[PDB]
Amino acid sequence: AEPEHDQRKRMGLKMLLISALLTSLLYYMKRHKWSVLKSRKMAYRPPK
Amino acid sequence: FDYLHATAFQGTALARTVEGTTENIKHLTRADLASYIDTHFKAPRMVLAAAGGISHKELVDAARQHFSGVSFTYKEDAVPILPRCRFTGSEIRARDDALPVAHVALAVEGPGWADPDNVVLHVANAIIGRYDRTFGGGKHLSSRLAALA
Numbered sequence: 001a002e003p004e005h006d007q008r009k010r011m012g013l014k015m016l017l018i019s020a021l022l023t024s025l026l027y028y029m030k031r032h033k034w035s036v037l038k039s040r041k042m043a044y045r046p047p048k
Numbered sequence: 049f050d051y052l053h054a055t056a057f058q059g060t061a062l063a064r065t066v067e068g069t070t071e072n073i074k075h076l077t078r079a080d081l082a083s084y085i086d087t088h089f090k091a092p093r094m095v096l097a098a099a100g101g102i103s104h105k106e107l108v109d110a111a112r113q114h115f116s117g118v119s120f121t122y123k124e125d126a127v128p129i130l131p132r133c134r135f136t137g138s139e140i141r142a143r144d145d146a147l148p149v150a151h152v153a154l155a156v157e158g159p160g161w162a163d164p165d166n167v168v169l170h171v172a173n174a175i176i177g178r179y180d181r182t183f184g185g186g187k188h189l190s191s192r193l194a195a196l197a
């Protein structure tokens with residue numbers, strides 16, 4: 001019913017590792033760029 | 049430029065304005081001022097400079113005469129080396145849409161007097177140059193940035 005059975009799982013394995021690796025790296029990258037806004041501070045200084 | 053300094057060297061001495069703070073001016077003491085002069089205005093940290101039609105010998109003579117006070121200890125002849133100021137890649141944006149035009153200042157950390165690279169850097173700046181709306185050269189100025197401007 002499904003001759004690809006084995007290949008399909010061998011792929012699923014590779015897909016997972018790369019998936020973990022990439023999701024990780026991209027998470028850092030995203031955080032790294034957003035750091036500029038995440039830590040940003042601001043104040044209201046009217047001529048009051 | 050004060051904001052540039054305030055952020056480029058945030059958390060250090062160079063981050064302060066020369067005129068100081070409002071609070072300081074309101075509360076500085078006859079003492080503090082005296083203390084500043086005593087602590088800072090000292091012989092090894094000073095230079096008497098003269099340019100024009102004057103005799104060096106004649107000049108140095110007058111110096112010895114009114115620049116008296118000699119030092120006893122070793123601390124009085126020591127020129128203190130200041131704690132280094134840390135540069136920080138950052139930004140400060142003071143927004144007020146009610147002002148007529150915007151001012152932007154961007155910069156990287158320079159080497160400091162001693163370094164020979166300063167020569168090149170000034171040559172560099174010479175290439176980019178400067179510009180303002182009353183430069184007659186106009187669209188023909190040699191500075192690419194002035195041209196586009």
Ligand SMILES: CCCCCCCCO[C@@H]1O[C@H](CO)[C@@H](O)[C@H](O)[C@H]1O
Binds near residue numbers: 010014
């Ligand atoms: C999130 C994106 C994940 C992409 C994972 C790519 C891994 C697929 O890799 C595949 O593995 C099979 C089994 O060894 C081989 O037969 C295929 O030729 C190969 O392309």
